[PDB]
Amino acid sequence: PSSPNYDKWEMERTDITMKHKLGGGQYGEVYEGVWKKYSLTVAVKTLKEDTMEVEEFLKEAAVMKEIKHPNLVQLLGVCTREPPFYIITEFMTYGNLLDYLRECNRQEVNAVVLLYMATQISSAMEYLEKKNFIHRDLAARNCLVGENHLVKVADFGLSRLMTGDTYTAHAGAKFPIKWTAPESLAYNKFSIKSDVWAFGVLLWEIATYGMSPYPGIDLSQVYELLEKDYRMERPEGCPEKVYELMRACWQWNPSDRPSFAEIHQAFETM
């Protein structure tokens, strides 16, 4: 603290022991680490080369210092002095939520756990809304599961890392089409209300244990279908009030969609 200039986030590289990369590789340069002096497992995001990709890294770190919520990824410290630069967060032990849902025992991860996981996310988004932060890529793949069904919303920059049809072209721009609000597809602008759309698809994800949205529909077909008022059907075993919440998040006009504050209230009140 005595230091005049000072940064409470900056700390010692040699405190962290870096293990192998996470999620094999399809989540980018994010590593398992141990912060030995605390016996804490961590997730470390590094930056190689001299590069001027450096600007983004420092944006990310500056965003994360602002964000403080039990259901949002939490910055534990950084290393910016010398290469590689490090962003350090707590390791969520069960990995991403999509795979967690797909690979889980449904008796242990039963319907109340699903609804508890959904309430955690809605609460995270309530906080972000209050902060006026637009997430832009909300999806199970960007949520993380920790101990005892703790869920945290993150953003792994997955549009530049995932191969396949998750991120695709629509009218000459790139989108995770299945999570994308119609006005975002058509006008390439985003809002908290477009995150609300994403939230409704994420709900459907949770409710189906990680099925790919719009089954039976060709991707080139979703905009036209949404415009004709097609929406996904209620998943098997999904609570009536949860499906109604989905259908509200998927109102054509952004102004008819609930706020996240309202979405959380629906969870409290259901």
Ligand SMILES: CC(C)(C)c1cc(NC(=O)Nc2cccc(Cl)c2Cl)n(-c2ccc3c(c2)C[C@@H](C(=O)O)NC3)n1
């Ligand atoms: C809104 C909120 C969910 C709080 C969030 C969380 C992160 N970031 C993050 O969750 N990062 C992370 C995840 C797991 C493990 C680690 Cl070690 C980290 Cl650092 N951002 C974030 C901020 C800025 C940037 C990115 C991500 C990604 C990066 C890119 O364009 O590629 N551009 C800048 N916004």
